[PDB]
Design a protein around this ligand. Structure first.
Ligand code: FES
Length: 56
C-alpha cells in the first residue's frame, strides 16, 4: 500500500530503504521523501520502520 500519498511511497519501499542501508525514520525520510510534505503519514511510516527492524 501507499504509506505516503504525497510522495508516492509504499510500505515495500520503506522496507527496501532499510534493507538497503537506512536504520531510522529520519534516514528513510531523506532517502525516499516519505513524510516530507503534509507529514500525516509519519506515524505509519515509523511503524513500518519499527516492524522491519524488529524482523531483522
Ligand atoms: S501523506 Fe506523506 S507527507 Fe503527506
Amino acid at each position: 500500500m501507499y504509506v505516503c500519498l504525497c510522495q508516492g511511497v509504499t510500505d515495500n519501499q520503506i522496507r527496501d530503504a532499510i534493507y538497503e542501508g537506512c536504520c531510522s525514520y529520519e534516514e528513510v525520510r531523506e532517502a525516499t521523501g516519505v513524510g516530507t510534505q503534509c507529514g500525516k503519514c509519519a506515524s505509519l511510516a515509523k511503524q513500518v520502520v519499527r516492524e522491519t527492524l524488529n524482523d531483522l
